[PDB]
Amino acid sequence: FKPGNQIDFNRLFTLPVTELFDPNTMFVYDQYVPLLVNLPSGFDQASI
Amino acid sequence: QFLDGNFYDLNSTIAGVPLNIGFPSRVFAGFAALPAWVIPVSVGSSVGIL
């Protein structure tokens, strides 16, 4: 996970948190994963 | 992929010996910083106008 000094709060929170995830299953949508978690080069982004 | 089903790139070896096949490198450029300035700038502009 990204540490608190690496978060640009206006990019995450210009919209409410209400729609970052699917209401049917509570998993967060794929576009927000690399914004919150660091991953290596060549990584399969569908795996996490 | 080559004929043997395996992928080769700039760093490929056989028996530890670099193949140095000669794949190209292409540059893509122009990418820029994000809009984080917009709201502080739009307050600034109003205060300035005032």
Rounded to a whole number, what is the distance in angstroms from the first to the last CA of chain B?
64
Resolution as reported, in Å: 11.0
How was this structure determined? It was done by cryo-EM
Subunit contact A8:B39, Cβ cutoff 8 A = no
What are the Cα distances from residue A3, in Å, to A8, A12, A24, B36, B44? Answer: 11, 14, 29, 19, 30
By residue count, chain B amounts to 50
Sign of CA dihedral B33, B34, B36, B38: positive
CB contact (8 A) between residue B39 and residue A10: yes
Chain B residue numbers with beta carbons less than 8 Å from the beta carbon of A10 are 36, 39
